[PDB]
Every structure is written in structure tokens, then in C-alpha cells.
RNA sequence: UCGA
């Protein structure tokens, strides 16, 4: 199975809540080209490659470990969507 | 068929010996009802059990050991067959080929 | 005319992943309400009933649910396939549908 | 591979000392898996002859060719003196190695008896319950690889003599013939009319079919427990009882397309072969 | 076009047992015999008891004893070879086989001794008899001693083998296999086409939709019914996006 | 002890080998790997390339010839030919059969560095006045590669055939008990080598053993690591 | 009652030509069929 | 154009393959398990491989 | 799309009786229907494949 | 073409080595030979029968000791030693402990160049006043030799014991088809090997491969018997 | 109409 699942499900009450979380965060990772994330070089989800070993481009896996640490924060009505989305596309290109 | 329902019809598997009836009790039927008969009431017989099935179904050896389902499948699959360049006829067949 | 107990699989389908409606006293181990059920729980109920301690099994059921245009978790049960309490925003209508739907081919007998 | 192999060859004789029984084992007076008696406490020849301090030792001794894959032997294996089969120890082992610890693993599994469908199922449930998703998945896959290759080593196959009709068929069935002669001589004596004759005959073939079916399974157990067909459908690999009955046994009477069941016995099994008649009715 | 049989193609026998090709094995590894002649299929014994067809079994036995002989076998339906006949065929072919190794400077293989010994436990071969006679019986039963072409070691018990008739079915993976990324659409409704040569995608049935909902994948379903299928700018803006 | 090794050949065709005594259970470990690589990595020919001045494709029936083209191809991969030189990669062969005379591997045009192991191999039964010109490139390589996975491109029609190299017909090893050693139940391994003549049983075993020991001592300096 | 010949093999066209269908224009149709329709009558035997 | 599947492609599609997974369905669709999802692994052939256990 | 072929089984010349087969068919082996082949078959659970 | 060899090991216990990639079929070719030769060869501890004071039968219970005789025998089998000098192929270790003592593999009274690589093992427990003396016989060699084979009796009442030879426990290699670039035909073969501490996994391996190229180089001289 |  996908590594670190049981704990993931163990976090959110709704089995589906996790999905919303993963989706939004991962998409945000694709937005900024991975400079947002709380993962350091050792935690970077490197994918095995014959050519050369690089970071896995897939946003989903990234989101997985991202929440796996717990450095993130998830909640409904967290902050107004305005300042929430305006300062996200600012900090990073 | 209508006339078949009339007489007493034995089987091809009857106790054939010396062109005569061997054992007293013999396979037979009327209208499709299995009944044991005697050397007297014998009226008709079968040419060969082959007639009790179709073409492809008759190309299956030891078919009496296979359930009807998979037999059916075997036959229609014989229809599904394709040509073969090196094709080799069954080294065990029913001799009908 | 001898009243017997529903065999294992029956109650296993009946009480598994249930939610206690009211408190239960049997065999010294008290079962508070709202507590879900597992094979351990269900088999325990089995044995308890075998002792003639209990017969009736009060539980919250979809029928007894007053949730409108849907249902609740306390009225439903586990997620079955996940063995854990059913998640909110669940497909339960379709769940049910398929659940009894797949067997549709196998009752000829 | 988890099956416990036992032989009836040794007859389970009475020995005061282990050594006597051992010499008897060499001379062929006893079987390796035979439940014989030593001193005041009975035991298999293997439980004595083969003694292992730990699984790996037994693994070496067996796989080296000095012992068969399933026999009654003695081992410690997580700090207890137990008498079981190599495939059993292997079982608990692979479970543990799949999950990552063999303690709880061995804890929730049956360490006595061979593992078939339902037992496996129970274990899977206990797994996804006490353990968690990924663990259970890796477990299952271990069962896949190991199991597949195990059946591969087995080479268990199917052949004409691999299901043999019990000797009880001839006897009980011809008995049913005599009984039919009774019912028929009744029908003309006035004691039995037509319909009730039909009923007596119908129950006659009922109980006949059951006598011979019972005979089939009993024969497969009492004699050839390692019978491939038997074992197969038995452990829930592939099959059902009625199948085994019709394949080796009496296939049983058929049903008219109108829905009123036939009065004529089909007798002979699939391997015996069916006459044209039986085949058509069926 | 010459089409060699590919991996995954439909094949079946006269006795009504189907299947598809799974991973053709190299000539190297294969369960050969003391003559070093490996087998060509190695079909699993499962579908036999469930689907109840013994004809393939008997056919395979007659082919076992018959391969050595090469003579043909006419077994008309309900009238033909029986257990005693084929039994004699087995005893015959074996006599001449043990003969084949006897004069060629061989004898009983230790691995075969092992298999015979293990089989002697369940009474598969009548005990008290020498391994020669025992292999006569075993071979007669339809099964002989096979050696794994991978390890070289024998198998725990005998394996029924022989000559049996099969067939290469019409359905061929080289044809049935199809896929499409973005193709044309129906005129009436922008829903994609279907069929193979029409270059079109699969349809998602009502029950498919239901199952998808049962999982509770909301977006997967939405994208399915919209972006992924006929949506106005949806498919277009999609291609744009991934591109 | 001393591993007494006796090596039996017969011709370039059929030969066996016996080594006794040996350690209990070893005979498996010897016998199978040998056979494995013995049936695979051994180079051979079974031709590849074929051309005829009369044909469209692998099908169209040549007048004066009983079998069609692809049947003559059924007779191709079944043809074994060895070169008298180790260093000749590719080659070519020329064939002419006119009149009502049959065609066989021996009917070819002999040359340097070529020998046919089966001149009695039937090709086509040529009827009255059948005229046919033929040419084939018989190359050498390893294993078995179907015609569809390798190209040719000679002339107007250049049609590949399967390449079954593997000159070994078959390998059968048997582990028996030998009286030839100190203890009890030893392994006398008899490896039976069936070859077609492109390579004698002896040298077949030789090259097999070569790749064996080589890929064996392939274990070099590794890289360790620990959790 | 008229369709593409079965040329999948010789035995294919053979068998196909030897097959009979109760369907079509003036037989029964898919919508109407019972048990007795597709069943095998007692006297069937050496006929079908 | 030109079936020239040479390594330029065969190994790039790889770089996009990892992570995201696809779905497989076997008609009829009865249980939801009739549609499951698996990590794509490219294999030589025109056929489809699937885990023997979920096949049931 | 199934190929139709007829292979001559008779030599350059010989005398035959009436009914003797001079040519094969899409599947015909010497006057016998040849569907598949009789190739060697084993029965066992091989690596669960 | 470039059979990269990697070995990741931990302690004198475990090691896992992969040759990635390898030719198709070769990955299964080296698995079983290395398997059986690893387990049927490579000598080691090999502990035989031990005399015991006051202990006659292998059954009769021993006063002043928790575990019975047989349990102790198991504990003896588990132990592992090594001869520092190839000169000494046989030794007799001894131990004597009385009273309430904790009896271990460490308490064992030493010997000549024989060394115990297993310092902590629980052999037995002695109750108050428990008297014990034993002299154990230890040797070398490979494979497995149960109490049946070796008839070893040193002193009068000495009791034969199953001898553990090969340092390795199990091997059972895991091979799998891998993929690099194109051509799915590659082999990923992996080995899980165990060691009792005598030799580190890498050592056992290399020794095995030595046995391998040796027995492989057994083929030089032919003897021509052709029929 | 035929596969599944
Ligand atoms: Zn509610």
C-alpha cells in the first residue's frame, strides 16, 4: 500500500477530508515549483531513476509526506480566501 | 418423431453379440422414457450414438466423461478456431475427421 | 418449538459495526452506549446470550435515524471495508445498492 | 505444506524405551509419523528422532534432504516445547517476516492444525484489525509469492486414478437394486400403488446417493488424505462436495425438462463414464 | 500478416477448458524428464474439478502412453478407449521406455527414488515393490517424475503429463487491444466515439458511475462526466493544461 | 577426494559425460545450471536471410515447386550449418535446382568455411522442369531471435526467418549413487548432451562451462551499508 | 436468417450451415421466450 | 509518425509515470471493487497484468 | 480474415484411386481436420502463473 | 554486459547481495547451486556428544537444575565456537558449576585455541546445592549430522547430539524480472543469507563461490568411450 | 450474431 496510510486516516475524522487536504496542498506545490514546502533535502521524496536520481515531480506523493510530518495545518474556515490566496501567489513565482 | 414415440427403441450401446441379443435386460424407451426390456419386445435400435450430438460435439473423445457445460463450450470453441500453418490433427480423435 | 440462537454468521452480519443505543449489563463487563462493535464485541454478546444474560440487542439503525436527506454515523456503523466508523459524506445509498447488488447473479438455487 | 502428514503403517505399537521403537523404525516395523507409545507417554517416531532447538536448525535439517517437509517433530521456537510439522513453523515464520515481528504474528495463528481457506481468512481479519493497512498488504503479498511457489514445489496434479470410486458403490447400489425389486413386487401386490411406489423409489435413490457420497468422502479420508482432488476441494482451493460426488461417485438422478424429476438412476461417475442415456437426461 | 502466437492470446481444448497465454517461459527452464525433453504448457489443475471435465484427463493419459508409440487414437463418442485398454498402453510404453534407458547405460535416478519414496507415504505407489515397478505404476497413473528446469530438483510428487489436443482461439490480443487519448466526437452530442477502428474511448456505464460514487471520488466522477468526456472547453483546456 | 571425470562423445552429434564420485546432493547443483545455460547462450546459425529472384513475398507459389515459400522456410530453421572459421560473422550461399530434380541442403553451392550437417534435409519436391534460383545469408549469434525482431534489407525482397542458434538439441542430467568414493550415497552425475553438429557435445560443454565460471567469478568488490 | 458466412474455418461454415434458429420473421422473438421454448423435448434425441 | 519508440520516449513516459496511478474495471461493475486503482508499470506486451487476488 | 490454403500432398507423379486426397485445406492434415496441436502437456500449479 | 555487484550487510549476522542486472534465466541459474552448496558445505561449530556426571540416560531428570537434560542439549546445539588453529580438528570443552549459579556459555571452562564466539547463552539454571559436571566434544565439518549418524561416545555415559555445522541458517534466494531502459528480460536476483557468527555473510558467500569455480574447473581431461 |  501507500506508505504512511494508517496514520493519515488516523488524523482526519472523515476519510474524505484527507483527500481534500492532499488535493489542495499538492496543487499548491505544482503552483510554485516545489518552493513552498516544509520538506528539507533529506525528506525530499526522491524517485529512483536510471539517468539521475531527482525529486519525484508528482504532487500527490509530496503531499503525502508533507502531511506525514504534520508540519502543515488543515481546517475549515481557516482564513478568508482573499488574503489566503493573495499572499500565496506572492511569496513564490 | 411422431412415429418415434410409437415403437420401442433400444440403444446403440445394447449388448451386441453374434448379431443377437445377449443379456435379457436391455436399454430402451418410448417417447423418451427409459425402460428395461426383454429379447422379445425389442423393436428398434440405434445406428450409432454419434447421431445424439452435433458435428463439433462429436469430435470430442471420451466426451462421456465431460459435463455438458464445458462440452458445449468445447464445441462452439471449435467454431472459434483459426487456421494453422503447421497444424496437426489430434493424435487422439473420434475418427470422424 | 425450541428457541435457538441465530448461528454465527447471522449475528456477525447483524451486530457488526453497530452503535449501542443504551447501556448494557451482562457478565460483569458493562457496555456503555455509543460504543461500537467488533468481532470481539459481537462474540462477547454471543457468549453473554449463551449464559441467558441477554436476548434483545438495542442499537441505532438507519431506520431509526432522523437525519433528513441522508443518515448519520451513530445510526450506521463502521465503514465495513475500512473496519472503522463510517466517514462523513459517505455513499451509503450506493454502498447498500452495490452491496446487495453483486449477489444478484448467484441466487438460482 | 501446512498439512500434518500421518501414516498408519507403524500401527502404534507399545514400547517401554525409545531405543526399541527406534530400532523398529529402522527395521520398518514402524512409520515415521506413526503415533506409537514410549515408556508411559505415547509419541511419534519423529518427535523423538528429530529434535530442534530453533526453526533455522530444522530448516537446514529438512531442506538438506534428511527430513520430509511435513512430519511430527519437536521444536522450541519462541520459548516453548511443541510438537508439530516443519511447514507449521515455516507458516508462523513467514507471517512474522511479512509483518515485521513474529511475536504477535504467531500469537494470533493456529500452531496445531493445517491452514486452509477459512483459517487464512480469520488471520487476515486479525491482521487488518490489530495491525494496519500497509502491513496487511505486504503480508498478503508474501502469501502470494510464498504460496504460489509452494504449490509449485508440491506439483499436486490431477489424474484418472487420483479419484477412485470406493468399493462400497457396487455393494450398496446393488442393494438398492434388490430393494427396487422389493418395491416393484409390492406395486403388483396391492400394498403399494403407483404414486407411493414412485415416492418409495425416490427416497430409495435419495438414500442411495447419500450412502455412496458418504462412501466417497470417507474413503478419501481413511485412505488417501493426500488425494489431490480431495485436498483441493477440501481446503477450499477449488470445488464443492456435490462436484466430488459426481466426479467420483454416483452422479445421481436427473430432472425432466417438465420439472418432475426422473425415476431412473444414472449410477456411473464421470470417470466411469456415462452411457448415452444418462448423458441425455442430464 | 504472419501472426505468431503472442502473450495473452485465447487458447482452449476440445474438452471445454479455456484460458489465455501468461508469460511464455524460455526453453532453458522447464519441467523436463530423464530424457531431458521439457514440456510445452504446464496447465494448472484447478478448473478441472470445478468445471468437471475428465475427458481432457483421459485424453492426456492416452497421449501420455501414445506419444511414445505415435499411433493414432480413434475414440468415438461413448464408444472407444476404456481404463483397461489405456492401462495396457501405459504398461507397454513404459516397458519400452525403461528399456530405452536400460540399454543406453542408465538406471533409476536418485531424485526419482526420492519422489517414489514420498509418494509411497500416501500409498500412491504400492509399497514393497522395487522403484522400477513403482515407476511403472506411477507412469501408468498418468503421472511421471518431473525436474524443475529452474532448480533441477524434482517435485514433491508425480505430475500427470502427456500428449493433449489444444487450439488457438479467434480472439487475438493483437486486435482486441485498443486505446485513445483524444479522438473525434459524435455530431449530435459531443460525447466521444466508441469502437476500435472508430478510434474512440470506453464508456462509463450507469453502474460504473454508481461504483465510482461508492468509493466517494467526487472529482474523478466530475472530470469523468465533464472534462474527460464531452465538456465544451473542458477537454480542450485540459489538453492545454497537461501540454 | 579425486573427481574421476570420463567424457564420452559420439561424432559431432550425440555425446554424454560422467563424473564420479561427488558429495551428496551436489549432483543437482552441478547438473541444472549447466543445462540451463547450455540450451541458451551457445551460439549457432539456423540462417536468417533468404532471397529468390522469383517471388513477391514469403507466400507466392513458385512454379515447379510443390511446397510454397513459407514451407521451404519450414525447412530453413531446421537446417544446421557450421563454419570452418571462428572469425566469420556473416556469409552468403547460392543455390540452383533445375529440371525434375529435388532440392536439399547438399544441393547448394559449396564454398570455403562452410559445411552442411544434413545434406539429406528435404527442401522442396521439384516437379517436371522446375527452375529455381536461391540465396541465403546464414549468420551467427546467440540465443533465439524471431524474424520479426531483426531486419535484413538485401534486394527487392529480403525476408527474415527465425534464428534458432542453440546447436544443442537437448540436455538431460541424472544423479545416481556411485560406489566410487569413501562414504555412502554419493552423486555420480551423468550429463547427456544432444547436439546437431554445429558444435560437438564436448566443445558445447566447454563453452557452457566458460560462461559459467566467468559469470560465476563476477562477484567483485561490493558496496556495504547498514541501518 | 441471412448473414455473414462463417469462414473462420471449414468446420465453421459447416456447423453454421447446420445450425437452426427459432428466431426471425414469423418465429418467436427475444421478448417472448419461456422455459419450454429453449428447452430440450423428450423425443429430441438423434435429431438436434 | 514513425513507430520510432527509441529510448527517448520509453524512458521519459517513465519519469511522468511514477506517483500518479490509474484505474482498472472489469464489466459487469457490481461491487465498487469492480473498479480499482493500481500503480502503472509498463511491461512489454499487448496484454494486462493484475494482482491474482483482487481478480476475484 | 482467416487464411485459406491448400497444400498438395502428392508427388511429381503417381497413380491414385477415386476419392484420394491430392490437396489439403485451411486446416486439413492428410484428410483430417487439424485445429491445434497435440503438444506435450503438464499439469501443476507453476509459480501461480 | 556490466553485471554490477552490490552487497549490503549488517554485522556477522545478515547480508543481502544483488547482481543487478543479469541475463534472463541466469538469475535462476545461480540460485539453487549457491543455495545447496552454501547449506551442504562451509564447515563450522559442529558440536557432538557430551559426558555428564550423574547423568546416565538422556531422559532421567537432573536434580538441582531447572531445565531437564534434553533442554540443556538444545542449548548445547545452539552454541558456536571456532578453532583458531587449523591444527586442532578436535577438542573437549568442560564445565563444572555448583550451588546457586547462573550457568551460561561464558561460564564454560575454556580450552586450547578453541574460542567461543557466543559469550552469552543461557545453558541452564542451578538451584541450591545443584551439582553439575560435563565434558563436551566439538569438531569440524559441514552439512548436518543427527544423533543417528555419529555414534560418538567419549566417556561411559556420553550422549550423542545433533551437530550444527554450516554457519548459514537459511538462504532461499529471491529472483525477480527487472527493467532498465528497454528489454524487460533482465534479472534482479537477490539473496537473503544468515550466519551464526562463525563467518560473516560475505565470507560464507565467497567461500561458496570458491567451491563453485573449483568444481567448475574439474573439467579438463576427456576419456573417449564412443559407442 | 459472439466473446467476458
Ligand atoms: Zn441518525
UniProtKB/Swiss-Prot annotation, chain A:
Catalytic activity annotation: RNA(n) + a ribonucleoside 5'-triphosphate = RNA(n+1) + diphosphate
Superkingdom of the source species: Bacteria
Enzyme class (EC, first level): transferase
Gene3D superfamilies registered for this protein in UniProt: 3.90.940.10
Keywords: DNA-directed RNA polymerase, Nucleotidyltransferase, Transcription, Transferase
Gene Ontology biological-process entries: DNA-templated transcription
Coiled coil: none
GO cellular component, one term: DNA-directed RNA polymerase complex
GO function term, MF aspect, one: DNA binding
Keyword Membrane on entry: no
Enzyme Commission code(s) on record: 2.7.7.6
SMART domains, sorted: RNA_pol_Rpb6 (SM01409)
Pfam families, per database record: RNA_pol_Rpb6
Subunit structure: The RNAP catalytic core consists of 2 alpha, 1 beta, 1 beta' and 1 omega subunit. When a sigma factor is associated with the core the holoenzyme is formed, which can initiate transcription.
Family as reported in the entry's similarity comment: Belongs to the RNA polymerase subunit omega family.
NCBIfam families membership: rpoZ (TIGR00690)
Free-text function comment from the UniProt entry: Promotes RNA polymerase assembly. Latches the N- and C-terminal regions of the beta' subunit thereby facilitating its interaction with the beta and alpha subunits.
Name of the protein: DNA-directed RNA polymerase subunit omega
Curated annotation (Swiss-Prot), chains F, J:
An example Gene Ontology molecular-function term: protein dimerization activity
UniProt GO cellular component terms: cytoplasm; DNA-directed RNA polymerase complex
UniProt EC number: 2.7.7.6
GO biological process, one term: DNA-templated transcription
Broad enzyme group: transferase
Region feature (Alpha N-terminal domain (alpha-NTD)): 1-223
Reactions listed under catalytic activity: RNA(n) + a ribonucleoside 5'-triphosphate = RNA(n+1) + diphosphate
Assigned protein family: Belongs to the RNA polymerase alpha chain family.
Record remark: domains: The N-terminal domain is essential for RNAP assembly and basal transcription, whereas the C-terminal domain is involved in interaction with transcriptional regulators and with upstream promoter elements.
Function: DNA-dependent RNA polymerase catalyzes the transcription of DNA into RNA using the four ribonucleoside triphosphates as substrates.
The protein, known as: DNA-directed RNA polymerase subunit alpha
Shown chain mapped onto the complete sequence: 7 to 233 of 314
From Swiss-Prot, chain G:
Source species, domain of life: Bacteria
Assembly behavior: The RNAP catalytic core consists of 2 alpha, 1 beta, 1 beta' and 1 omega subunit. When a sigma factor is associated with the core the holoenzyme is formed, which can initiate transcription.
Function of the molecule: DNA-dependent RNA polymerase catalyzes the transcription of DNA into RNA using the four ribonucleoside triphosphates as substrates.
Family to which the UniProt record says this protein belongs: Belongs to the RNA polymerase beta chain family.
Protein name (database record): DNA-directed RNA polymerase subunit beta
Organism: Thermus aquaticus
Gene name for this UniProt entry: rpoB
From Swiss-Prot, chain H:
Superkingdom as given in the UniProt entry: Bacteria
Family: Belongs to the RNA polymerase beta' chain family.
Subunit and partners: The RNAP catalytic core consists of 2 alpha, 1 beta, 1 beta' and 1 omega subunit. When a sigma factor is associated with the core the holoenzyme is formed, which can initiate transcription.
Function of the protein: DNA-dependent RNA polymerase catalyzes the transcription of DNA into RNA using the four ribonucleoside triphosphates as substrates.
Protein name: DNA-directed RNA polymerase subunit beta'
Organism: Thermus aquaticus
Lineage summary: Bacteria, Thermotogati, Deinococcota, Deinococci, Thermales
Gene expressing this chain: rpoC
Residues of the full protein shown: 679 to 734 of 1524
Amino acid at each position: 500500500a501507500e506508505p504512511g496510510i494508517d496514520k493519515l486516516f488516523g488524523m482526519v475524522d472523515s476519510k474524505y477530508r484527507l483527500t481534500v487536504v492532499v488535493a489542495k496542498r499538492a496543487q499548491q506545490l505544482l503552483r510554485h515549483r516545489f518552493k513552498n514546502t516544509v520538506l528539507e533535502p533529506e525528506e525530499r521524496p526522491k524517485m529512483r531513476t536510471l539517468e539521475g536520481l531527482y525529486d519525484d515531480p508528482n504532487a500527490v506523493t509530496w503531499a503525502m509526506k508533507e502531511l506525514l510530518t504534520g508540519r502543515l495545518f488543515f481546517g475549515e474556515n481557516l482564513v478568508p480566501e482573499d488574503r489566503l490566496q493573495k499572499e500565496m501567489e506572492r511569496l513564490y513565482p | 418423431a411422431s412415429e418415434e414415440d410409437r415403437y420401442t427403441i433400444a440403444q446403440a450401446n445394447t449388448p451386441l453379440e453374434g448379431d443377437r441379443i445377449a443379456t435379457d435386460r436391455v436399454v430402451a424407451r418410448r417417447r423418451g422414457e427409459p425402460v428395461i426390456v426383454a429379447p422379445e419386445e425389442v423393436e428398434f435400435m440405434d445406428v450409432s450414438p454419434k447421431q445424439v450430438f452435433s458435428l463439433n460435439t462429436n469430435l470430442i473423445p471420451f466426451l462421456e466423461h465431460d459435463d455438458a457445460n464445458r462440452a458445449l463450450m468445447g464445441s462452439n470453441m471449435q467454431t472459434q478456431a483459426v487456421p494453422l500453418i503447421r497444424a496437426q490433427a489430434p493424435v487422439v480423435m473420434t475418427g470422424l475427421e | 418449538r425450541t428457541l435457538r440462537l441465530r448461528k454465527r454468521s447471522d449475528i456477525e452480519s447483524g451486530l457488526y459495526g453497530r452503535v449501542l443505543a443504551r447501556e448494557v449489563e451482562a457478565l460483569g463487563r458493562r457496555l456503555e452506549e455509543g460504543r461500537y462493535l467488533s468481532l470481539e464485541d459481537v462474540h462477547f454478546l454471543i457468549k453473554a446470550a449463551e449464559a441467558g444474560e441477554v436476548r434483545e440487542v438495542p442499537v441505532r439503525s438507519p431506520l431509526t435515524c432522523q437525519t433528513r436527506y441522508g443518515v448519520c454515523q451513530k445510526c450506521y456503523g463502521y465503514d465495513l471495508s475500512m473496519a472503522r466508523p463510517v466517514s462523513i459524506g459517505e455513499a451509503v445509498g450506493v454502498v447498500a445498492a452495490e452491496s446487495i447488488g453483486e449477489p444478484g447473479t448467484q441466487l438460482t438455487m | 505444506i501446512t498439512q500434518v502428514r500421518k501414516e498408519k503403517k507403524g500401527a502404534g505399537m507399545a514400547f517401554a524405551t525409545p531405543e526399541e521403537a527406534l530400532a523398529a523404525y529402522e527395521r520398518g516395523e514402524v512409520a515415521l509419523n506413526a503415533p506409537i507409545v514410549v515408556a508411559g507417554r505415547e509419541t511419534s517416531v519423529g518427535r523423538l528422532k528429530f529434535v530442534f532447538a530453533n526453526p533455522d536448525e530444522a530448516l537446514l535439517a529438512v531442506a538438506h534432504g534428511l527430513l520430509d517437509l511435513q512430519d511430527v517433530v519437536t521444536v522450541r521456537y519462541l520459548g516453548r516445547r511443541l510438537e508439530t510439522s516443519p511447514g507449521r513453523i515455516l507458516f508462523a515464520r513467514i507471517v512474522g517476516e511479512a509483518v515485521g515481528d513474529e511475536k504477535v504474528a504467531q500469537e494470533l495463528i493456529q500452531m496445531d492444525v493445517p491452514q486452509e481457506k477459512n483459517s487464512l481468512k480469520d488471520l487476515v481479519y486479525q491482521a487488518f484489525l490489530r495491525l494496519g493497512m500497509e502491513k496487511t498488504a505486504r503480508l498478503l503479498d508474501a502469501l502470494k509469492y510464498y504460496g504460489f511457489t509452494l504449490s509449485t514445489t508440491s506439483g499436486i496434479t490431477i489424474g484418472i486414478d487420483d479419484a477412485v470410486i470406493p468399493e462400497e458403490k457396487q455393494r450398496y447400489l446393488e442393494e438398492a437394486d434388490r430393494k427396487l425389486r422389493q418395491i416393484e413386487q409390492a406395486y403388483e401386490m396391492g400394498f403399494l400403488t403407483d404414486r407411493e411406489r414412485y415416492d418409495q423409489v425416490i427416497q430409495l435413490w435419495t438414500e442411495t446417493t447419500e450412502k455412496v457420497t458418504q462412501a466417497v468422502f470417507k474413503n478419501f479420508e481413511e485412505n488417501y488424505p493426500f488425494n489431490p482432488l480431495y485436498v483441493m476441494a477440501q481446503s477450499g482451493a477449488r470445488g464443492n462436495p456435490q462436484q466430488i460426488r459426481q466426479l467420483c461417485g454416483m452422479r445421481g438422478l436427473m430432472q425432466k425438462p417438465s420439472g418432475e424429476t426422473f425415476e431412473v438412476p444414472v449410477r456411473s461417475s464421470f470417470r466411469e463414464g456415462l452411457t448415452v442415456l444418462e448423458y441425455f437426461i442430464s | 500478416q504472419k501472426r505468431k502466437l503472442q502473450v495473452g492470446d485465447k487458447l482452449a481444448n476440445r474438452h471445454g477448458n479455456k484460458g489465455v497465454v501468461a508469460k511464455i517461459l524460455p526453453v532453458e527452464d522447464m519441467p523436463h524428464l530423464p530424457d531431458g525433453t521439457p514440456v510445452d504448457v504446464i496447465l494448472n489443475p484447478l478448473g478441472v474439478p470445478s468445471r468437471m471435465n475428465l475427458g481432457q484427463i483421459l485424453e492426456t493419459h492416452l497421449g501420455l502412453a501414445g506419444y511414445f508409440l505415435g499411433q493414432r487414437y480413434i475414440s468415438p463418442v461413448f464408444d472407444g478407449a476404456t481404463e483397461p485398454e489405456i492401462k495396457e498402453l501405459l504398461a507397454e510404453a513404459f516397458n519400452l521406455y525403461f528399456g530405452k534407458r536400460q540399454g543406453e547405460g542408465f538406471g533409476v535416478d536418485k531424485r526419482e527414488k526420492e519422489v517414489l519414496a514420498r509418494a509411497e507415504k500416501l500409498g500412491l505407489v504400492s509399497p514393497g515393490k522395487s522403484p522400477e515397478e513403482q515407476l511403472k505404476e506411477l507412469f501408468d497413473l498418468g503421472k511421471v517424475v518431473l525436474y524443475d528446469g529452474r532448480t533441477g530438483e524434482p517435485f514433491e510428487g508425480p505430475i500427470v503429463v502427456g500428449q493433449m489436443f489444444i487450439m488457438k482461439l479467434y480472439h487475438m490480443v493483437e486486435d482486441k487491444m485498443h486505446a485513445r487519448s483524444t479522438g473525434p466526437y459524435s455530431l449530435i452530442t459531443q460525447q466521444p466515439l466508441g469502437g476500435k477502428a472508430q478510434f474512440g474511448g470506453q464508456r462509463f456505464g450507469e453502474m460504473e458511475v454508481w461504483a465510482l460514487e461508492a468509493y466517494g471520488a467526487a472529482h474523478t466522477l466530475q472530470e469523468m462526466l465533464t472534462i474527460k468526456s464531452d465538456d465544451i472547453e473542458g477537454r480542450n483546456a485540459a489538453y492545454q493544461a497537461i501540454i | 577426494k579425486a573427481p574421476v571425470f570420463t567424457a564420452t562423445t559420439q561424432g559431432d552429434h550425440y555425446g554424454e559425460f560422467v563424473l564420479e564420485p561427488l558429495e551428496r546432493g551436489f549432483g543437482v547443483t552441478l547438473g541444472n545450471p549447466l543445462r540451463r545455460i547450455l540450451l541458451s547462450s551457445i551460439p549457432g546459425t539456423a540462417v536468417t536471410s533468404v532471397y529468390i529472384e522469383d517471388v513477391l513475398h514469403e507466400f507466392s507459389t513458385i512454379p515447379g515447386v510443390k511446397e510454397d515459400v513459407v514451407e521451404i522456410i519450414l525447412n530453413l530453421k531446421e537446417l544446421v550449418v557450421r563454419f570452418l572459421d571462428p572469425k566469420m560473422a556473416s556469409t552468403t550461399l547460392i543455390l540452383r535446382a533445375e529440371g525434375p530434380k529435388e532440392v536439399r541442403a547438399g544441393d547448394f553451392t559449396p564454398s570455403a568455411d562452410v559445411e552442411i550437417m544434413n545434406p539429406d534435409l528435404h527442401i522442396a519436391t521439384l516437379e517436371e522442369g522446375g527452375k529455381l534460383y536461391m540465396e541465403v545469408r546464414v549468420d551467427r549469434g546467440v540465443g533465439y531471435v524471431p524474424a520479426e525482431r531483426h531486419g535484413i534489407k538485401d534486394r527487392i525482397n529480403a525476408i527474415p526467418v527465425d534464428a534458432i542458434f542453440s546447436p544443442v538439441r537437448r540436455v538431460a542430467f541424472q544423479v545416481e549413487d556411485t560406489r566410487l568414493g569413501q562414504r555412502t550415497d554419493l552423486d555420480k552425475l551423468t550429463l547427456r548432451i544432444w547436439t546437431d553438429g554445429s558444435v560437438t557435445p564436448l566443445e558445447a560443454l566447454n563453452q557452457a562451462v566458460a560462461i559459467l565460471k566467468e559469470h560465476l567469478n563476477y562477484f567483485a568488490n561490493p558496496e556495504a551499508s547498514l541501518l | 436468417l441471412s448473414q455473414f458466412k462463417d469462414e473462420t474455418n471449414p468446420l465453421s461454415s459447416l456447423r453454421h450451415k447446420r445450425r437452426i434458429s427459432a428466431l426471425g420473421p414469423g418465429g418467436l422473438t427475444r421478448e417472448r421466450a419461456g422455459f419450454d421454448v429453449r428447452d430440450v423435448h423428450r423425443t429430441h434425441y438423434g435429431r438436434i | 509518425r514513425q513507430r520510432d519508440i527509441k529510448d527517448e520516449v520509453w524512458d521519459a513516459l517513465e519519469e511522468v509515470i511514477h506517483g500518479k496511478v490509474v484505474l482498472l474495471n472489469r464489466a459487469p461493475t457490481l461491487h465498487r471493487l469492480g473498479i480499482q486503482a493500481f500503480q502503472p508499470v509498463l511491461v512489454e506486451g499487448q496484454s494486462i497484468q493484475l494482482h491474482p487476488l483482487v481478480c476475484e | 480474415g482467416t487464411a485459406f490454403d491448400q497444400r498438395p500432398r502428392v508427388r511429381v507423379g503417381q497413380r491414385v484411386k477415386k476419392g484420394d486426397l491430392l490437396a489439403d485445406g485451411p486446416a486439413s492434415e492428410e484428410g483430417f481436420l487439424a485445429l491445434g496441436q497435440n503438444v506435450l502437456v503438464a499439469i501443476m500449479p507453476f509459480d501461480g502463473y
